[PDB]
Amino acid sequence: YMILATIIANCIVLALEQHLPDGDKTPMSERLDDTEPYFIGIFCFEAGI
Amino acid sequence: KDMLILVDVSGSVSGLTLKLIRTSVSEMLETLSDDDFVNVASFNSNAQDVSCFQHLVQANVRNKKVLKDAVNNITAKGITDYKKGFSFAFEQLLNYNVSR
Numbered sequence A: 001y002m003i004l005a006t007i008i009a010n011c012i013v014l015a016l017e018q019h020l021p022d023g024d025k026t027p028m029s030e031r032l033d034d035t036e037p038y039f040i041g042i043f044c045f046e047a048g049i
Numbered sequence B: 001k002d003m004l005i006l007v008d009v010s011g012s013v014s015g016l017t018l019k020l021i022r023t024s025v026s027e028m029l030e031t032l033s034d035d036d037f038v039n040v041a042s043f044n045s046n047a048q049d050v051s052c053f054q055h056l057v058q059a060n061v062r063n064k065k066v067l068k069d070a071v072n073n074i075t076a077k078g079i080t081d082y083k084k085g086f087s088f089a090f091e092q093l094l095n096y097n098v099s100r
Protein backbone atom coordinates (compact mmCIF):
# COMPACT_ATOMS: atom_id res chain seq x y z
CA TYR A 1 0.00 0.00 0.00
CA MET A 2 2.94 2.36 0.57
CA ILE A 3 4.09 1.41 -2.94
CA LEU A 4 0.59 2.20 -4.20
CA ALA A 5 0.69 5.59 -2.47
CA THR A 6 4.10 6.48 -3.92
CA ILE A 7 2.86 5.42 -7.37
CA ILE A 8 -0.15 7.73 -7.01
CA ALA A 9 2.21 10.48 -5.84
CA ASN A 10 4.35 9.96 -8.95
CA CYS A 11 1.23 10.20 -11.12
CA ILE A 12 0.22 13.43 -9.37
CA VAL A 13 3.72 14.87 -9.88
CA LEU A 14 3.54 13.95 -13.57
CA ALA A 15 0.12 15.60 -13.83
CA LEU A 16 1.38 18.77 -12.14
CA GLU A 17 4.11 19.42 -14.73
CA GLN A 18 3.71 22.14 -17.35
CA HIS A 19 5.66 22.28 -20.61
CA LEU A 20 6.91 25.54 -22.14
CA PRO A 21 7.99 26.08 -25.74
CA ASP A 22 11.70 26.69 -26.24
CA GLY A 23 13.59 25.66 -23.13
CA ASP A 24 11.56 27.69 -20.65
CA LYS A 25 10.62 26.01 -17.38
CA THR A 26 8.09 26.98 -14.75
CA PRO A 27 9.45 27.52 -11.22
CA MET A 28 7.36 24.57 -10.00
CA SER A 29 8.75 22.31 -12.73
CA GLU A 30 12.15 22.60 -11.04
CA ARG A 31 10.75 21.19 -7.79
CA LEU A 32 8.76 18.51 -9.63
CA ASP A 33 11.95 17.48 -11.45
CA ASP A 34 13.99 17.42 -8.25
CA THR A 35 11.39 15.13 -6.65
CA GLU A 36 12.20 12.33 -9.12
CA PRO A 37 15.09 10.59 -7.27
CA TYR A 38 12.76 9.71 -4.39
CA PHE A 39 10.42 7.90 -6.79
CA ILE A 40 13.24 6.14 -8.63
CA GLY A 41 14.67 5.09 -5.26
CA ILE A 42 11.40 3.65 -4.00
CA PHE A 43 10.89 1.78 -7.27
CA CYS A 44 14.43 0.41 -7.04
CA PHE A 45 13.52 -0.68 -3.50
CA GLU A 46 10.44 -2.58 -4.67
CA ALA A 47 12.46 -4.11 -7.50
CA GLY A 48 15.18 -5.21 -5.09
CA ILE A 49 12.69 -6.81 -2.73
CA LYS B 1 11.31 60.05 -21.16
CA ASP B 2 14.18 57.70 -20.38
CA MET B 3 12.81 54.29 -21.32
CA LEU B 4 14.47 50.98 -21.06
CA ILE B 5 12.15 48.59 -22.86
CA LEU B 6 12.68 45.21 -21.20
CA VAL B 7 11.59 42.44 -23.56
CA ASP B 8 10.99 38.95 -22.18
CA VAL B 9 12.36 36.70 -24.93
CA SER B 10 12.23 33.41 -23.07
CA GLY B 11 10.85 30.09 -24.22
CA SER B 12 7.33 30.79 -22.98
CA VAL B 13 6.79 33.72 -25.38
CA SER B 14 7.42 31.69 -28.55
CA GLY B 15 5.05 31.96 -31.49
CA LEU B 16 2.18 34.44 -31.12
CA THR B 17 3.30 36.15 -27.92
CA LEU B 18 6.69 37.01 -29.43
CA LYS B 19 4.99 38.44 -32.52
CA LEU B 20 2.76 40.60 -30.34
CA ILE B 21 5.71 41.66 -28.17
CA ARG B 22 7.79 42.76 -31.15
CA THR B 23 4.91 44.64 -32.77
CA SER B 24 4.15 46.21 -29.38
CA VAL B 25 7.77 47.30 -28.91
CA SER B 26 7.76 48.82 -32.39
CA GLU B 27 4.56 50.73 -31.63
CA MET B 28 6.03 51.77 -28.27
CA LEU B 29 9.10 53.17 -30.01
CA GLU B 30 6.77 54.97 -32.42
CA THR B 31 5.62 57.15 -29.48
CA LEU B 32 9.12 58.35 -28.60
CA SER B 33 10.18 61.82 -29.73
CA ASP B 34 13.68 63.23 -30.17
CA ASP B 35 13.86 64.51 -26.58
CA ASP B 36 13.30 60.98 -25.25
CA PHE B 37 16.17 58.54 -24.85
CA VAL B 38 15.54 54.82 -25.20
CA ASN B 39 17.28 51.47 -25.06
CA VAL B 40 15.73 48.06 -25.66
CA ALA B 41 17.05 45.18 -23.57
CA SER B 42 16.02 41.53 -23.64
CA PHE B 43 16.44 38.97 -20.86
CA ASN B 44 16.26 35.18 -20.61
CA SER B 45 18.24 34.02 -17.54
CA ASN B 46 20.59 36.89 -18.44
CA ALA B 47 19.86 40.31 -19.90
CA GLN B 48 21.45 41.81 -22.99
CA ASP B 49 20.87 44.70 -25.36
CA VAL B 50 18.93 43.74 -28.46
CA SER B 51 21.06 46.04 -30.63
CA CYS B 52 24.52 47.58 -30.94
CA PHE B 53 23.58 50.25 -28.39
CA GLN B 54 24.97 49.73 -24.89
CA HIS B 55 23.25 52.74 -23.31
CA LEU B 56 20.18 54.95 -23.61
CA VAL B 57 20.40 56.48 -27.08
CA GLN B 58 18.35 59.36 -28.41
CA ALA B 59 15.02 58.27 -29.87
CA ASN B 60 15.43 59.78 -33.31
CA VAL B 61 14.35 58.07 -36.51
CA ARG B 62 17.59 56.25 -37.29
CA ASN B 63 18.23 54.98 -33.76
CA LYS B 64 14.59 53.94 -33.53
CA LYS B 65 14.96 51.95 -36.75
CA VAL B 66 18.08 50.26 -35.37
CA LEU B 67 16.10 49.29 -32.28
CA LYS B 68 13.10 48.16 -34.35
CA ASP B 69 15.27 45.90 -36.51
CA ALA B 70 16.97 44.50 -33.41
CA VAL B 71 13.54 43.72 -31.93
CA ASN B 72 12.30 42.14 -35.16
CA ASN B 73 15.41 39.93 -35.24
CA ILE B 74 14.82 38.74 -31.68
CA THR B 75 14.18 35.09 -30.81
CA ALA B 76 12.53 33.23 -27.94
CA LYS B 77 14.66 30.72 -26.03
CA GLY B 78 15.67 29.92 -22.47
CA ILE B 79 14.30 30.37 -18.99
CA THR B 80 13.19 33.68 -17.46
CA ASP B 81 14.99 35.64 -14.74
CA TYR B 82 13.19 38.85 -13.78
CA LYS B 83 16.06 39.76 -11.43
CA LYS B 84 18.90 39.71 -13.98
CA GLY B 85 16.74 41.69 -16.40
CA PHE B 86 15.69 44.36 -13.94
CA SER B 87 19.26 44.62 -12.66
CA PHE B 88 20.32 45.36 -16.24
CA ALA B 89 17.48 47.85 -16.75
CA PHE B 90 18.13 49.76 -13.53
CA GLU B 91 21.88 49.80 -14.20
CA GLN B 92 21.31 51.22 -17.68
CA LEU B 93 19.05 53.90 -16.22
CA LEU B 94 21.92 54.88 -13.88
CA ASN B 95 24.41 55.30 -16.75
CA TYR B 96 24.97 59.06 -16.64
CA ASN B 97 28.15 58.96 -18.75
CA VAL B 98 25.95 59.29 -21.86
CA SER B 99 23.52 61.84 -23.22
CA ARG B 100 20.13 61.50 -21.54
Ligand SMILES: *[C@@H]1O[C@H](CO)[C@@H](O)[C@H](O)[C@H]1NC(C)=O
Pocket (backbone or CB within 6 Å): B073
Ligand atom coordinates in the same frame (compact mmCIF):
# COMPACT_ATOMS: atom_id res chain seq x y z
C1 LIG C 1 19.98 38.69 -36.74
O1 LIG C 1 19.55 37.99 -37.91
C2 LIG C 1 20.59 37.18 -38.50
C3 LIG C 1 20.03 36.61 -39.78
O2 LIG C 1 19.49 35.31 -39.58
C4 LIG C 1 21.03 36.11 -37.50
O3 LIG C 1 22.10 35.37 -38.07
C5 LIG C 1 21.48 36.76 -36.20
O4 LIG C 1 21.75 35.74 -35.24
C6 LIG C 1 20.40 37.69 -35.66
N1 LIG C 1 20.87 38.39 -34.48
C7 LIG C 1 20.95 37.82 -33.27
C8 LIG C 1 21.47 38.69 -32.16
O5 LIG C 1 20.62 36.65 -33.08
Ligand SMILES: *[C@@H]1O[C@H](CO)[C@@H](O)[C@H](O)[C@H]1NC(C)=O
Pocket (backbone or CB within 6 Å): B091, B094, B095, B096, B097
Ligand atom coordinates in the same frame (compact mmCIF):
# COMPACT_ATOMS: atom_id res chain seq x y z
C1 LIG D 1 30.83 55.75 -16.19
O1 LIG D 1 32.13 56.29 -15.92
C2 LIG D 1 32.66 55.94 -14.64
C3 LIG D 1 33.98 56.67 -14.51
O2 LIG D 1 34.63 56.80 -15.76
C4 LIG D 1 32.80 54.43 -14.53
O3 LIG D 1 33.26 54.09 -13.23
C5 LIG D 1 31.47 53.75 -14.81
O4 LIG D 1 31.63 52.34 -14.83
C6 LIG D 1 30.90 54.22 -16.14
N1 LIG D 1 29.60 53.61 -16.40
C7 LIG D 1 28.51 53.80 -15.64
C8 LIG D 1 27.28 53.06 -16.07
O5 LIG D 1 28.52 54.52 -14.65
Ligand SMILES: [Ca+2]
Pocket (backbone or CB within 6 Å): A024, B010, B011, B012, B013, B079, B080
Ligand atom coordinates in the same frame (compact mmCIF):
# COMPACT_ATOMS: atom_id res chain seq x y z
CA1 LIG E 1 8.82 32.86 -19.17
